[PDB]
Amino acid sequence: GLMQFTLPVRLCKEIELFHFDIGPFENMWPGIFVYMVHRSCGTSCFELEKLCRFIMSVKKNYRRVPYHNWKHAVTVAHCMYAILQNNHTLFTDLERKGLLIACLCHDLDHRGFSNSYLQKFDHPLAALYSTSTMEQHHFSQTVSILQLEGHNIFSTLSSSEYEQVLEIIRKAIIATDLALYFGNRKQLEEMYQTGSLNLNNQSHRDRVIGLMMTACDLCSVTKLWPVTKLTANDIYAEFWAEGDEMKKLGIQPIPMMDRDKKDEVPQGQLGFYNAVAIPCYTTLTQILPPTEPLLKACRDNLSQWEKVIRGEE
Ligand SMILES: Cc1nc2ccc(CCc3nc(-c4ccccc4)cn3C)nn2c1C
Ligand SMILES: [Mg+2]
Ligand SMILES: [Zn+2]
DSSP: OOOOOOOOHHHHHHTTSTTOOOOSOGGGHHHHHHHHHHHHTOTTSSOHHHHHHHHHHHHHTSOOOSSSSHHHHHHHHHHHHHHHHTTGGGSOHHHHHHHHHHHHHTTTTOOSOOHHHHHHHTOHHHHHOSSSHHHHHHHHHHHHHHTSTTOOTTTTSOHHHHHHHHHHHHHHHHTTOHHHHHHHHHHHHHHHHHTOOOTTSHHHHHHHHHHHHHHHHTGGGGSOHHHHHHHHHHHHHHHHHHHHHHHHTTOOOOGGGOGGGGGGHHHHHHHHIIIIIHHHHHHHHHHSGGGHHHHHHHHHHHHHHHHHHTTOO
16 A cells, blocks of 8 residues: 555656657566556556556467567557646546556457458458457457456446446557547547537547547657667568468468568658558647647657658668
C-alpha cells in the first residue's frame, strides 16, 4: 500500500515525454507499466499482486515475432500513458483503468500475419471472426487471461462498472484494426469541422478513443529518428515473411510485403506518413491539443524519409 515503484532519474523524467523508448532491458518493462498505471490511475486502481500476475500472463501470451511482440505492447501502453497524463481532466476513472490494459493486451497472441493472410490461408480464426479477425482474437485472449484464477484485476468493480470497462477494452482493441481507422478519422474530421463533436455523447467518445488507439499503435513514427528507422526494419521483417508465405500459396504479395522490392521502402514510408500517420496525429491534435508533440515528431520523421530518398542518407 505504501509501496511505490520508482525509476532511475533519466527514465523518471523521460517516461513523461511522448518520444520515450522503453529500452532493451526486457526485465524492466513490467516495472515501467506498473509505474504508469500508478501515476495514470492511482496506487489503489489494482491489487499489486493480481496486477503483477496479469502482466506476466499477458507477456507469456505475446510471441517471439519481430514486431508484434511484448515490446510493442508496452510501447503502445506508454504512448497512451503520455496522452492520458497530458489530458488529466478529460477522462473517466473507468477509462484510465481500461485504456492502459487495452493497450497492453491489444495484440495478444499475434502471429506476425495480417487479417488478409489468415483469410487467404483459410485459418480457423478467419471462420470464427469474418472481420477484424486478429483483433477479435486479441480481445478473446484478454478475457481468457482476466478469467484465470488470481488474475481478475477488476474484482473490486461493480457488475455494471465491470461490463463498462470490458466494453471500453473491446472497442479500443477492435479500433486497432487499421481498416476501420480511415472511416473513423473522416467522421471525427467532419464532426470537429461542423462543430457537432460532443464528448458527452458516448458514440463520439468511442470514436475519439478509437483514434487515440490508432495514434498509440502507430507511435513508432513519433520516436527519435534512430528508433523510428530501426523499428521500421522489424515492421518490414514481418511483412516480408508474410510475402514469402503469400508466394507459397501461389499469390504475388503486394509490394509492401515483397522482399524483392526492398528498394521502394523509402517511397512506401512517404505514402504511409501522408495517407495514414500525418492525418491521424493532425485530427488527434485538433481534438486533444496537448498531443501536438506526436504530430511534430511524425512530421520530423517524414522529413528524415524525404532525406533518405534524396540520397542525403
Ligand atoms: C508504425 C508503422 N506502421 C506501419 C504499417 C505499414 C508500413 C509500411 C508502409 C508501406 N511500405 C510500402 C512499400 C515498401 C517497399 C516497397 C513497396 C511498398 C508501402 N506502404 C504502404 N509502415 N508502418 C509503420 C512505420
Ligand atoms: Mg494489431
Ligand atoms: Zn499493435
